[model samples]
Target: AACEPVRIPLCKSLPWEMTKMPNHLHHSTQANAILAMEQFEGLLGTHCSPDLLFFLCAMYAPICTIDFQHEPIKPCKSVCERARQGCEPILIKYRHSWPESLACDELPVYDRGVCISPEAIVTAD
Candidate 1:
């Protein structure tokens, strides 16, 4: 008879610290770069559109690596404003596919990565 192999728990989500610009954070305003900093802050208190998240992940990834010749304030301000407006479109495009059954709740959050959804845990059980 053969024995079954042990199952190891796997991480099923992305983390913040693990998030690096796919290339570099340059080529954008410093404001945009700083605004993108929210992505690294873990989940926002409210549920956000996944598309928005994706846009942020994509745009900010490049922004973080840019070297600022002058003060970062102006660019940072502009980027922040752009990022704020960017959320709606992203959510509208991607909301249907988000795992909404799981409410955004929980504490002791990590600075990087997502907490597994309650639904995920239930399925694992």
Candidate 2:
């Protein structure tokens, strides 16, 4: 005789507020990390180069504990600028890879910081 186990909904709260036990946000964060890695892979596929590779490696080499309980990760300006500098050569070489407008679609009220490429966050090498 075979019996199926019953399934139950975990948390009904938002990701940031779902801190109680028996929650699924922790697993969801792991999935988000995987998706982020995949996005980085796709970005790299478009602009594969030695300098870009080195830059990405340096950016994500540090080991940090995952804290899903906190707010979304917002990289600092200095870190973002450093990453942008590292990608400058590649950006120059592959000008077509960037948006032709050279402007963000929507402007921020304040400078959130330089935009970081997905490679900078996903690459551990």
Candidate 3:
């Protein structure tokens, strides 16, 4: 018998090979997280919340662009911190539910904290 490629409804393509780290240190985790968020946002359709959207974007910025040897965390940190603060209220309200609902448990803790509280200041590595 011959086999054919399986089809998943509404499925979209993603660049799983891309990452901020060229040596594949944290590429899979970071790329998958971003892809997951992109899918979720698509499902949210017209009802997507700006706060959540901002939060997700902020959370991925550093993961997507960080080059520990060359790039500084200051720029990404600043944007993420601001976005996180803006999304804090909504995130707190849905804290228990959002992670499960959004399948965002993979979101890095460092990113989450920066966005979840005003006092979250990014310190040196």
Candidate 4:
């Protein structure tokens, strides 16, 4: 389905449930997204970046709005970068590498389009 609840644990706290599938990694289903996200579950408790949850949620089950024709709004480059910088040292300490799928260079700048970010949310409010 194109729209579903944000069932991924790290994402459930997101304000809206209109999350979309076929995420960045091309997980066509929510179950697949959930399974993929499990790899980073341990990081949540660490609270590495205050924006970490928001970044992960945006990637795994991006916010889908009718205004965007139901397309999921990916997280902005800065959002990904902030979370990466915050968690990188911790990941390295644990012998973990950043996921290839989350490289910030692949994301658009926040001001370029309908991308999402924790700061953007704050600014909009």
lDDT of 3 by residue, 5-122 (tens): 2121222232221223221123323445445555555324443343344344333332233334332122233444444444445556655224432233333346334322123348
Which digits, one per residue and each the tens of the lDDT, describe model 2 over residues 21-91?
Answer: 11212222333333433434544555544233333322222112244222222233344344445454566
List the lowest-lDDT window of 10 residues for candidate 2: 6-15
Q: Which residue pairs overlap in candidate 2's backbone? A: none
lDDT (tens digit, per residue) of candidate 4 on 1-125: 45677788767777767777677777778888888779777897798988888888788888876555334678888888989999989999989878888988988744547577675444654
- 2 or 4, which is superior by lDDT? 4
Model 2: runs farther than 4 Å from truth?
A: 1-28, 39-73, 96-125
* Candidate 3 overall lDDT versus native: 0.35
lDDT comparing candidate 2 with the true structure? 0.31
Best by lDDT: 4
Candidate 3 backbone clash number: 1
Query: Which lDDT values do the candidates have, in the order given?
Result: 0.31, 0.31, 0.35, 0.78
Task: Look at candidate 3 and tell me the lDDT of residue 73.
Answer: 26
Residue-by-residue lDDT tens digits, candidate 1, 1-125: 11111111111132322222222244333344555455434434344433333333333332222232221112122333334454445445755322221212311123433221111123554
Which sections of candidate 4 miss by over 4 Å? 67-71, 109-112, 120-125
Alpha carbon lDDT at 119, candidate 4: 50
